[PDB]
Amino acid sequence: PRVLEVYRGVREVLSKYRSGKLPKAFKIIPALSNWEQILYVTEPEAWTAAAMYQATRIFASNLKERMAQRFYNLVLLPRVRDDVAEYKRLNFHLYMALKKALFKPGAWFKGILIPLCESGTCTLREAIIVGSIITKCSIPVLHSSAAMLKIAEMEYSGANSIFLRLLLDKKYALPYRVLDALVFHFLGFRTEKRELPVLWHQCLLTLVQRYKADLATDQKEALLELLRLQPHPQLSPEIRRELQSAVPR
Amino acid sequence: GVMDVNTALQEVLKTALIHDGLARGIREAAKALDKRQAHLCVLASNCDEPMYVKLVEALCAEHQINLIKVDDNKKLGEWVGLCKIDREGKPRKVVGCSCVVVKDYGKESQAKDVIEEYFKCKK
C-alpha cells in the first residue's frame, strides 16, 4: 500500500546515500515486527557502504542480540566477503561498520567470526582484516574465551591460526578448559604429515610467551615432543627456550 | 545454622553471576527493582549521599523488599567481581558498587537456607 512506495523511495535514497540525515522510516526499522519484508524492499545488496555503516549503527544500537546476529550473518558479512574478494581491501565505511558491529560482541562472534570460520572458504586477507578488527576492539573475557574454545574445537584452516593468535594477544585471564582445548588442538597437530606454515608456529609461539605459567608438566613435555616431531629451523628453538624457562603457578 | 551469612551472601552472588541475575550500581538496581522482577537489595553503609540511602530504604519498604547492609562499597565491589584480574588472578581495577540487587536465585540448599533463616530471624 502506502508503506510499500515509501520504502521504495527510501530504497532509492539508500542506493545513493553519502552523508546527512536519513529518513525516519529507516531508523524505526528495528522497532517494527515484519522487518524482513521491508528490509528486502530496501534491497540491502544495492546499498552504499556509508548507508550500510549507518544501518549497522542503527541495528547494533537497538538491543535484541538475536536480530543483530541475523543482520550480521545475512547482510553485513556477505558484503564484507564480497568487498575483500574484489577490491582486495576493506572500505573505510565498512571497516567502521564492523567496528560498530563489535559494539555488540555476542552477536558479532556468533554472527561474523564463527560463520566465516565454518564457511571454510575464508582467505588470508579476510583473516588479517577481521583479526585486526578484533585487535582494535576491547573484548569481554567470557566472549573471547568462548570464541577461542569454538575456534580451537573446529577443523583446521590456515586462516584460523591468525584469529587464534590475535585472540591470544589480548592477554586476558584464560579459563582452564580453553587452555585444555588449545593444548589438545596442538597435540592433534602431532601426527600430521602436512607441512605447517610459519603462522601456526607463531600461534604456538604466542601461546608459549603468554601462557607458559599456567601449563602442567605433562602437557609441557607433550609440547616439547610436538616441537621435536614438527620442527622449524627458526621458531622451534625459541619455543623450546620459552618452555624451558617457565615456572608454574 | 552451619555457615555464616557473609559466605551465603557471596554464594548467592556467585549463583547470580552464573544465572545473570544482578542489577548492580545505582539505576539498574533501581529500575529493575521498580519493574518488580527483582528480589533482594544490598546497600553499602559507607556512603557520601544520605537521601540516596533513604530512597533505597523507601524502595525496599514500598513492597516489602528485604534490605541487607554491608560496611564498605569497595568490599562489595570485590564481592560482586567488578575487578579485572591478571593471569594469576590478581585484581588491578578497583571499582566499588553501592546498590546490588539480586533478581534471580540459583537453586541452592545451603546458602538459601541460611539467608532464609536470617530473614525469618530479622522479621
Binding site: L149, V183, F184 | I18, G81
Partner: peptide, 18 residues
C-alpha cells in the same frame, strides 16, 4: 572435553558455554 585437566590452583569463574 579433554582428559588433561587443570589439576589444582583455584577456580575463579565457572564460565557460561551453553
Amino acid at each position: 572435553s579433554s582428559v588433561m585437566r587443570r589439576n589444582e590452583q583455584l577456580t575463579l569463574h565457572d564460565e557460561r558455554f551453553e
